[PDB]
């Protein structure tokens, strides 16, 4: 498994192949420069993302070389016992034995349980284990060629004196795979699968996922395998002994995947709500004209161009790299292009925004979002609201680029007390004018009457977008799938045929006028009520899903519309 | 492996020279000259603490002392010791191994003892903890200085937090002396970047040191070696990208790995210092695009702050005595000297105000960087309400107990008008109940930059300062300063093709295989930029300074200028409305 069954994390592999693989085959290249090359890593991130996978793949891609790189394991707090001087005696002969087998690695795991923050508010035994392990990582004599690797979820409860250079000195991050890391993950765990899956749905299964992560994508593919067995042999669930069965007659088809997509929740959505979903396809030919102008405007206010791996960036050539100037020109153009970006979707009540906000918020992959709205700002009663505001700002300031997102800003100013509006408005000006954070907001009161604090923010005419209601020569495309359904129904719709019952073997032991009428009857409607007509006459199609005569339903759905204006 | 050389004798230590001389007065010169110590009939003392933030030179000062005495001349002996190894399961042997230790050292009369991470060994004697820890400190309290003299054994301790040890151990006679390594400030980083590059065959030029000293603002001694070993490791990646993507040795000419300049500045973007992993330092220098708008006002505040609290740097005591003493035996010439530079200061306070976006939040955290050797902590909203466990008043108490420690320091509060509208009234009184009960001579400041301008401010501020010399009001930018601000833009509008770094695209590099081993319309625009911008504050000026760079970014490589002016007027024509 020599680094082949790990997808997406290409950049950290080349940074890892200089600590254990490349002082060892080229020792003379480190003796000109008189250096250590360093011996510490630290892994941190959200749960289920490929953390302990790399520490297993690394110790499997070293023993297959006959170079004899021995290593060790830990299981959290495991050098801890009831006797007095026992808890430190293990840590002496752990590092002692590691020296006498000189090329050696040590893997801790969940180091939060072992080394907390030193304070006088706890027992004294947790101070001695921290103070000892801090001391023999670099004493006044060296520790030999010993590489230390740790991992945890919350990288803040470890002691800050244990995060110095010389001890850990290299922090990584596994940020919940974005778009096409999921394309490679879902093709690793479905490798052989003898009628092999084509490319045209592996690019489709990636797009439906928006935050499964590397631990849930294996559970998606292993559930669709279990759904395929139930399709071909239902007799297996109704026995106790073995049966004469034959493999190599089961094929994972498309239906086994999509029925496994519907009944599975991912890992990070079981507690929270995760506000992002794409546009509804029935809603598409009414808002995509207004959608593209917003996506084109946001490129100017925050360019979010991707990151290149360094081995594909140094492979080019460049003639003039000696001067102190022209080095302060590459990142300078990408620095003052941005200056405090902000945006709104203001307009009338319900003609837009509530289905257009989370359409934008699922495009950016690249990022880390938050939500400063209700139901997450006051959903606990232990702290105040002036403390839960500060805790989110401490998170959004790291892991740039980021997005602050508030839906329904108009009621948001009438509910929070006034000593919390000032606290939120204070932290917006402490951070500098050049970092890459955004500020989305969605209002419902139209222009020239909005609240006098939304004018103190956003301070421009570029960062406000009006939302006028739609363009009569586009509504004839909105009802176009309906008129393709009022045309005759020879069970074109799914239904009408009570299909079949499968017999099982034994398996022994071993149309002109209403189209005009739809036009000069609404003519001023908003989309909030345009869904109502689409959700009214759609019931009329369901009740006539099996009749065979079409000159009569079209008089029903003109009777259905003639009282709706009333 | 490869190892490091054990030939370090007081030369690989930069920026610390006061402590080397005091350390040389304990092991080297009671022995070479014993005849001049009974002439005063004295002890000369034996004992040292080492306390400070992590990674500032505590080891590689104790380590260098052993190599400088063992390689000097015969003979000396020394005992290593880890954190806490002198305690085990059975009842009394934690005290047996300690009594074996000092007895063995006494039989080898010139000797020193290294205690490392002493907080695991001797905590504060209290009844809330199990008393085997109170026992082995008590026998160590009596073994250092008891009924019989211990001999010539010197004790050295290292500590990150110098407050958890017992106060009966810091008595003079047992430890006698405390040091403090203060996170190397400005000029110490010039040498501490120079020692670690005793250097490569293209030796590092002097003009970028100090330039890496200026960019560093709180790295320290540990991570500055990590900066140099990162850029050197980046150079191997440049000159041989075929070193990866293989398994065996290939071929190496280890001479074409000369380090260029670009590897340093690329390595500065990826490194984060050890002090800012959790918190955030409130200091950033002036941005070079903004400097001709504020440089006149920056030196004016600097000139006023020199008379309020002088903080001028002082010297090591060996260089002081090289100046000859004049006729001096009476303490009347020198009793002025302590009366002076004590009564020259009187409650130094300061406050910066004006209209919004007219200066401050930029020059605020800029004077906090230009002078060093002082302690900074921020009484901010993100630091008071940060902890949800304890009360809000206790956090104001626990910071005043810290700033009355070591040095000249600074109480720094941004945006004071958003203050007093968030905190309760019972906390505002408490913070005002500590500024008065400290004396009128401690060198502690009260920096506070503020909102909405003079004669409109609620009067709790107007008795805290209450003096004409301790308030400052900015103004709008003048006419003759604005045309200097837009000068690099209009310079960049002409010299198009080979100047912008987006012109000729970079070509591919070939790879060897490496086998195995055994002015026409310009002045219309120039006059247009004035007579349209007469009353702008300094923050919305930065809008148009940003709105013009997007224009040239789309035109990064197009030729035929005198066709790129026609879009800039309709930009600025939109702005006044
Ligand atoms: N790209 C991938 N391909 C196949 N499996 C993966 C991939 N990424 C993650 N996994 C699965 O995730 C599991 C755990 O990995 P990792 O420890 O990084 O997740 P985690 O969320 O950190 O778990 P924990 O937080 O409990 O340590 C592995 O068993 C592995 O099967
Ligand atoms: N002047 C210097 N030149 C080169 N390296 C230095 C210098 N000062 C300190 N260092 C580096 O600091 C490291 C640790 O030294 P020291 O133990 O004094 O720091 P520390 O903060 O006390 O660490 P700890 O608190 O963990 O003992 C050494 O590895 C050394 O490389």
Numbering used by the authors:
A (entry chain D): 263 to 772, 1131 to 1186
B (entry chain E): 256 to 773, 1128 to 1186
Give verbatim lines from the article:
We first solved the cryo-EM structure of Abo1 in an ATP-bound state to 3.5 Å resolution using an ATP-hydrolysis deficient Abo1 Walker B mutant (E372Q). The atomic resolution model revealed two layers of AAA+ domains arranged in a hexameric spiral, with the AAA1 domains forming the top layer and the AAA2 domains the bottom layer. Densities for six bound nucleotides were found at the interface of AAA1 protomers. We assigned five of the nucleotide densities as ATP, but the identity of one nucleotide (in subunit A) could not be determined with certainty although we modeled this nucleotide as ADP based on superposition with the ADP state (see below). No nucleotide density was found at the interface of the AAA2 domains, consistent with the fact that AAA2 has no consensus Walker A or B motifs and is presumably catalytically inactive. First, Abo1 subunits have a molecular clasp where the “knob” of one subunit locks into a “hole” of the neighboring subunit by an electrostatic interaction. However, individual subunits in the ATP state displayed a marked difference where the AAA1 domain and the linker arm progressively shift away from the AAA2 domain as the subunits rise in height along the spiral axis. We modeled this density as a 14-alanine chain, and examination of interactions between the polyalanine chain and Abo1 revealed that the W345 sidechains of Abo1 form a winding tryptophan staircase around the peptide, where the middle subunits (B–E) form direct contacts. In the ATP-state, Abo1 assumes a closely packed spiral that binds the histone H3 N-terminal through its pore loops and the histone body through its bromodomain.
ATAD2 (also termed ANCCA) is a histone chaperone that has been implicated in nucleosome density regulation by histone H3–H4 loading or removal. Here, we demonstrate ATP-dependent histone H3–H4 deposition onto DNA by Abo1, the fission yeast ortholog of ATAD2, using an in vitro single-molecule imaging technique, the DNA curtain.
